[PDB]
Enzyme design. Structure first.
Site, short mmCIF file in Angstrom:
data_model
loop_
_atom_site.label_atom_id
_atom_site.label_comp_id
_atom_site.label_asym_id
_atom_site.label_seq_id
_atom_site.Cartn_x
_atom_site.Cartn_y
_atom_site.Cartn_z
N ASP A 248 0.82 -1.20 0.00
CA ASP A 248 0.00 0.00 0.00
C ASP A 248 0.86 1.26 0.00
O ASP A 248 1.24 1.76 1.06
CB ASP A 248 -0.94 0.01 1.21
CG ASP A 248 -1.82 1.24 1.25
OD1 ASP A 248 -1.56 2.19 0.48
OD2 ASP A 248 -2.80 1.34 2.02
N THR A 249 1.17 1.76 -1.19
CA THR A 249 2.01 2.94 -1.33
C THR A 249 1.33 4.19 -0.78
O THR A 249 1.96 5.22 -0.60
CB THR A 249 2.39 3.21 -2.80
OG1 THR A 249 1.20 3.30 -3.60
CG2 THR A 249 3.28 2.10 -3.33
N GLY A 250 0.03 4.09 -0.51
CA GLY A 250 -0.69 5.22 0.03
C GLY A 250 -0.64 5.25 1.55
O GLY A 250 -1.16 6.17 2.18
C1 LIG Z 1 -11.16 3.29 -2.11
C2 LIG Z 1 -10.59 3.84 -0.76
C3 LIG Z 1 -9.86 5.10 -1.28
C4 LIG Z 1 -11.81 4.22 0.24
N1 LIG Z 1 -9.66 2.78 -0.09
C5 LIG Z 1 -8.99 2.89 1.08
O1 LIG Z 1 -9.03 3.89 1.80
C6 LIG Z 1 -8.15 1.68 1.49
C7 LIG Z 1 -9.00 0.89 2.50
N2 LIG Z 1 -8.39 -0.33 3.07
C8 LIG Z 1 -9.32 -1.11 3.95
C9 LIG Z 1 -10.75 -1.64 3.48
C10 LIG Z 1 -11.92 -1.05 4.01
C11 LIG Z 1 -13.22 -1.48 3.63
C12 LIG Z 1 -13.35 -2.52 2.70
N3 LIG Z 1 -12.23 -3.18 2.10
C13 LIG Z 1 -10.90 -2.68 2.55
C14 LIG Z 1 -7.10 0.05 3.73
C15 LIG Z 1 -6.16 0.86 2.79
N4 LIG Z 1 -6.85 2.03 2.14
C16 LIG Z 1 -5.95 2.77 1.23
C17 LIG Z 1 -5.03 3.76 1.95
O2 LIG Z 1 -3.77 3.82 1.28
C18 LIG Z 1 -5.52 5.22 2.01
C19 LIG Z 1 -4.61 6.24 2.74
C20 LIG Z 1 -5.32 7.58 2.48
C21 LIG Z 1 -4.75 8.75 3.23
C22 LIG Z 1 -3.46 9.29 2.93
C23 LIG Z 1 -2.98 10.39 3.68
C24 LIG Z 1 -3.77 10.96 4.72
C25 LIG Z 1 -5.06 10.43 5.01
C26 LIG Z 1 -5.54 9.33 4.27
C27 LIG Z 1 -4.51 5.92 4.27
O3 LIG Z 1 -5.37 5.26 4.86
N5 LIG Z 1 -3.43 6.43 4.89
C28 LIG Z 1 -3.09 6.28 6.32
C29 LIG Z 1 -2.79 4.85 6.86
C30 LIG Z 1 -3.27 3.53 6.62
C31 LIG Z 1 -2.74 2.40 7.31
C32 LIG Z 1 -1.71 2.54 8.29
C33 LIG Z 1 -1.15 3.80 8.61
C34 LIG Z 1 -1.65 4.93 7.94
C35 LIG Z 1 -1.35 6.40 7.97
C36 LIG Z 1 -1.78 7.04 6.67
O4 LIG Z 1 -0.87 7.02 5.57
#
Ligand SMILES: CC(C)(C)NC(=O)[C@@H]1CN(Cc2cccnc2)CCN1C[C@@H](O)C[C@@H](Cc1ccccc1)C(=O)N[C@H]1c2ccccc2C[C@H]1O
Lengths: 99, 99
Positions: A25-27
């Site tokens: 997960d690069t995000g």
């Molecule tokens: C389509 C949609 C966009 C709703 N998908 C997600 O959000 C998925 C969800 N799953 C789950 C899912 C949920 C429901 C159904 N199927 C799957 C878990 C992984 N995320 C993707 C993440 O990469 C999103 C990022 C977004 C973000 C970036 C910066 C600031 C706020 C939000 C994210 O969650 N980032 C945070 C993050 C995440 C994990 C651990 C540490 C951290 C810190 C931070 O980088």
């Protein structure tokens, strides 16, 4: 290995003597797992994601095998809907995005 | 090009005649932006991520130029803390994970 994105980029991992699948997960800045038993102390941490914030415990210096590669770093454990490997660990196994 | 993960993989994008910065997010199935004005009809949709679920607008067949590459797809617009480019669009420009 090279991995296309036409499906979720899942990888099998060993951590704490337990097996699991995490999504590359690069995000994600950090790495978090739904439910795994990790030994030792930990510091509370509240991470923010899409949809809200969650309370999780932070474990540092945790040995974790990602797709056969051995690395160590901080691993979070909390109420996530999917196990994710973040950049904090993806950098250690030399992962990059290409296009 | 090739992008390492020591920092967030942000890319500049043009959509609906507006300029935005977006995160190359292999962990996201869909693409979503905080606040843009896209024209035409949309469909209510609720997505879920870490921390919760959010109601968003779903616009299909929306032109979007990502890092100089022109593609078209479904773009979500809703209360997200960061603009994210998902696999639905990443595959279009041929992004892969490497290690
Ligand atoms: C389509 C949609 C966009 C709703 N998908 C997600 O959000 C998925 C969800 N799953 C789950 C899912 C949920 C429901 C159904 N199927 C799957 C878990 C992984 N995320 C993707 C993440 O990469 C999103 C990022 C977004 C973000 C970036 C910066 C600031 C706020 C939000 C994210 O969650 N980032 C945070 C993050 C995440 C994990 C651990 C540490 C951290 C810190 C931070 O980088």
């Amino acid at each position: 290995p090279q991995i296309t994105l036409w499906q979720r980029p899942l990888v099998t991992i060993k951590i704490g003597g337990q097996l699991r699948e995490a999504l590359l997960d690069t995000g994600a800045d950090d790495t978090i797992f739904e439910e795994i038993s990790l030994p030792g102390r930990w510091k509370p941490k509240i991470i923010g994601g899409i949809g809200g914030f969650i309370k999780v415990r932070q474990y540092d210096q945790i040995p974790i095998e990602i797709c056969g590669h051995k690395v160590i770093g901080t691993v979070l454990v909390g109420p996530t809907p999917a196990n994710v490997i973040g950049r904090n660990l993806m950098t250690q196994i030399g992962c990059t995005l290409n296009f």
